[PDB]
């Protein structure tokens, strides 16, 4: 019943070419979890724990939560971890999906493992995203930093384009978080 019920740990090492043996896909820049591509059997240097399977969602690297980050950030975390690499993953299916916007829509019970992971994934997405809003600029705010200040029409285009990972209203104004860029 729980989103995190099938989370497992796979301990791997770098293959003889220094790589992981699988490509990382998704990332917040596609509105997605980081998740694994095709796991070629024999390209992963397994160490302990459980095996990796294709298209599982990558949650943590050496106990650093990475879901909600770009692929840039995820690989940057990987690069600063010495072997062995402890990966926490979950297979997609049922309630578990790589789509970040839909995962942020889910209503979990406050205090649940599911809820705590959702807030962790929000903070990560917030690290490199600047929110957008239709309210007017207030004194002291830096456009492009505290907010992107856009009109209602522009906010509706971003929403209709699927650019927003999260949307809401407060005192008759629009707030949202756009997908981060690849830079």
């Amino acid at each position: 019943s729980h989103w995190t019920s099938k989370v497992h740990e796979s301990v791997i090492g770098r293959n003889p070419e220094g790589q992981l043996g699988f490509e990382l896909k998704g990332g917040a820049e596609n509105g997605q979890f980081p998740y694994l591509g095709e796991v070629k059997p024999g390209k992963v240097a397994y160490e302990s724990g459980s095996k990796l399977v294709s298209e599982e969602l990558l949650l943590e690297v050496n106990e650093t939560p990475v879901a909600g980050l770009t692929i840039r950030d995820v690989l940057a975390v990987i690069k600063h971890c010495k072997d062995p690499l402890r990966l926490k993953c979950v297979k997609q299916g049922g309630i578990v999906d790589k789509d970040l916007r839909h995962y942020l829509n889910l209503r979990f019970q406050k205090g649940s493992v599911d809820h705590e992971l959702q807030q962790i994934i929000r903070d990560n997405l917030y690290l490199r995203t600047v929110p957008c809003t239709t309210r007017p600029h207030k004194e002291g705010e830096v456009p492009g930093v505290d907010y992107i200040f856009i009109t209602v029409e522009e906010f509706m285009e971003l929403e209709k384009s699927g650019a927003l990972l999260e949307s809401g209203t407060y005192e008759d104004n629009y707030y949202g978080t756009p997908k981060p860029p690849a830079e």
Binding site: Y126, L127, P131, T133, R135, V145, E166, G168, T169, Y170, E171, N173, Y174, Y175
Partner: peptide, 11 residues
């Protein structure tokens, strides 16, 4: 960076 109270309410 971190979101204000207003943004957090809007969600």
């Amino acid at each position: 960076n971190l979101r204000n109270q207003s943004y957090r309410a809007a969600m």
